[PDB]
Motif scaffolding. Structure first.
Motif, PDB file in Angstrom:
ATOM      1  N   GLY A 279      -7.910   6.264 -10.680  1.00  0.00           N
ATOM      2  CA  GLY A 279      -7.571   4.631 -10.872  1.00  0.00           C
ATOM      3  C   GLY A 279      -8.213   4.485 -12.088  1.00  0.00           C
ATOM      4  O   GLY A 279      -9.221   4.476 -12.539  1.00  0.00           O
ATOM      5  N   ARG A 280      -7.714   2.989 -12.465  1.00  0.00           N
ATOM      6  CA  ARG A 280      -7.897   2.525 -14.326  1.00  0.00           C
ATOM      7  C   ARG A 280      -8.015   0.859 -13.872  1.00  0.00           C
ATOM      8  O   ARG A 280      -6.835   0.484 -12.791  1.00  0.00           O
ATOM      9  N   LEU A 281      -8.293   0.273 -14.399  1.00  0.00           N
ATOM     10  CA  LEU A 281      -8.122  -1.331 -14.137  1.00  0.00           C
ATOM     11  C   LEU A 281      -6.404  -1.178 -15.949  1.00  0.00           C
ATOM     12  O   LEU A 281      -7.015  -0.493 -16.840  1.00  0.00           O
TER      13      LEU A 281
ATOM     14  N   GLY B 235      -1.974  -1.077  -0.505  1.00  0.00           N
ATOM     15  CA  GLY B 235      -0.869  -0.089  -1.718  1.00  0.00           C
ATOM     16  C   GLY B 235      -0.846   1.154  -2.466  1.00  0.00           C
ATOM     17  O   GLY B 235       0.685   1.586  -2.732  1.00  0.00           O
ATOM     18  N   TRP B 236      -1.542   2.501  -1.968  1.00  0.00           N
ATOM     19  CA  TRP B 236      -1.577   3.610  -1.287  1.00  0.00           C
ATOM     20  C   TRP B 236      -0.753   3.392  -0.141  1.00  0.00           C
ATOM     21  O   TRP B 236       0.678   4.597   0.051  1.00  0.00           O
TER      22      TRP B 236
ATOM     23  N   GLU C  58       2.717   7.120 -10.964  1.00  0.00           N
ATOM     24  CA  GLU C  58       1.637   6.261 -11.044  1.00  0.00           C
ATOM     25  C   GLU C  58       2.184   4.630 -10.393  1.00  0.00           C
ATOM     26  O   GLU C  58       3.251   4.704 -11.094  1.00  0.00           O
ATOM     27  N   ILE C  59       1.127   4.517  -9.636  1.00  0.00           N
ATOM     28  CA  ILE C  59       1.382   2.994  -8.943  1.00  0.00           C
ATOM     29  C   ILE C  59       0.600   1.764  -9.951  1.00  0.00           C
ATOM     30  O   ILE C  59      -0.733   2.325 -10.472  1.00  0.00           O
ATOM     31  N   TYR C  60       1.385   0.452  -9.031  1.00  0.00           N
ATOM     32  CA  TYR C  60       0.704  -0.870 -10.270  1.00  0.00           C
ATOM     33  C   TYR C  60       1.020  -1.591  -9.250  1.00  0.00           C
ATOM     34  O   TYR C  60       1.665  -2.438  -9.387  1.00  0.00           O
ATOM     35  N   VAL C  61      -0.562  -1.887  -8.417  1.00  0.00           N
ATOM     36  CA  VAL C  61      -1.297  -2.805  -7.349  1.00  0.00           C
ATOM     37  C   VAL C  61      -1.624  -3.567  -7.558  1.00  0.00           C
ATOM     38  O   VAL C  61      -2.606  -4.342  -8.298  1.00  0.00           O
ATOM     39  N   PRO C  62      -0.807  -4.619  -7.107  1.00  0.00           N
ATOM     40  CA  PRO C  62      -1.454  -5.925  -7.035  1.00  0.00           C
ATOM     41  C   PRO C  62      -2.690  -6.395  -6.360  1.00  0.00           C
ATOM     42  O   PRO C  62      -3.029  -5.082  -5.400  1.00  0.00           O
ATOM     43  N   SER C  63      -3.374  -6.802  -6.579  1.00  0.00           N
ATOM     44  CA  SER C  63      -5.072  -7.218  -5.508  1.00  0.00           C
ATOM     45  C   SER C  63      -4.681  -7.459  -4.728  1.00  0.00           C
ATOM     46  O   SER C  63      -5.491  -7.371  -3.340  1.00  0.00           O
TER      47      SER C  63
ATOM     48  N   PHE D  29      -2.603   3.592 -10.152  1.00  0.00           N
ATOM     49  CA  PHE D  29      -3.508   4.539  -9.965  1.00  0.00           C
ATOM     50  C   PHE D  29      -2.181   5.865 -10.653  1.00  0.00           C
ATOM     51  O   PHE D  29      -0.730   5.429 -10.135  1.00  0.00           O
ATOM     52  N   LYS D  30      -2.195   6.869 -10.983  1.00  0.00           N
ATOM     53  CA  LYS D  30      -1.631   7.641 -11.419  1.00  0.00           C
ATOM     54  C   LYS D  30      -2.170   8.326  -9.929  1.00  0.00           C
ATOM     55  O   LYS D  30      -3.088   9.285  -9.824  1.00  0.00           O
TER      56      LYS D  30
END
Lengths: 113, 113
Positions: A34-36, A62-63, A77-82, A103-104
């Motif tokens: 997980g990364r910002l 998101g997961w 790879e997912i790009y999760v809104p807050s 998250f990858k």
């Protein structure tokens, strides 16, 4: 290759798998990072040495949204809104308010309950 | 009083239960609040409003040990040395390096297999 889902979750399939897709009662074995958006890694299964096992329902929305679409064996790879993550709350970490999370995720195995 | 275990884990029974104790492979449903020695709360089941379900083997070593000694229904407070928590590694945020963690854990239910 970034697909946008109705929830606002976005994902990129790195490699697709052939196993079954989990439901929310299922238990799932995964490895992830997980990364910002700045690139700071907040948690990883590499840091722990081992894969992670949890019930699909106990993870952030998101997961739970992505996992139900991932065949076992897949790497996305997912790009999760807050709003699909921790929202306006700052969660014990560099994760602050209304934080976008990347998250990858590698889904290893699915076990039914 | 505060019981001391060979690992360095310490616990105080707030309320005793009658139930079964989980094993390493077992799944557990709990209510918890985690804090540092200054009193900063880093995570809580109340912040989510719902209980948390985990595999006993998938949590930090202080919890893995404590849960297996907790009868279901029990309420303990555990005092986890960094070694039995996240250690010298730091979570990149509030926890920080070699931090002692205090958890108020309420073991609600135990699942087998």
């Amino acid at each position: 290759g970034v697909v946008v889902l109705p929830s606002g979750l976005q994902y990129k399939v790195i490699n697709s798998g052939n196993g079954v897709k989990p439901g929310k009662s299922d238990t799932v074995t995964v490895e992830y990072t997980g990364r910002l958006i700045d690139g700071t890694v907040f948690d990883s299964t590499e840091k722990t040495g081992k894969p992670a096992t949890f019930q699909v329902s106990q993870v952030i929305p998101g997961w739970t949204e992505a996992l139900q679409l991932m065949p076992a064996g897949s790497t996305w790879e997912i790009y999760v809104p807050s709003g699909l993550a921790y929202g306006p709350r700052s969660v014990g970490g560099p994760i602050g308010p209304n934080e976008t999370l990347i998250f990858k995720i590698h889904l290893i195995s699915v076990k039914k309950s």
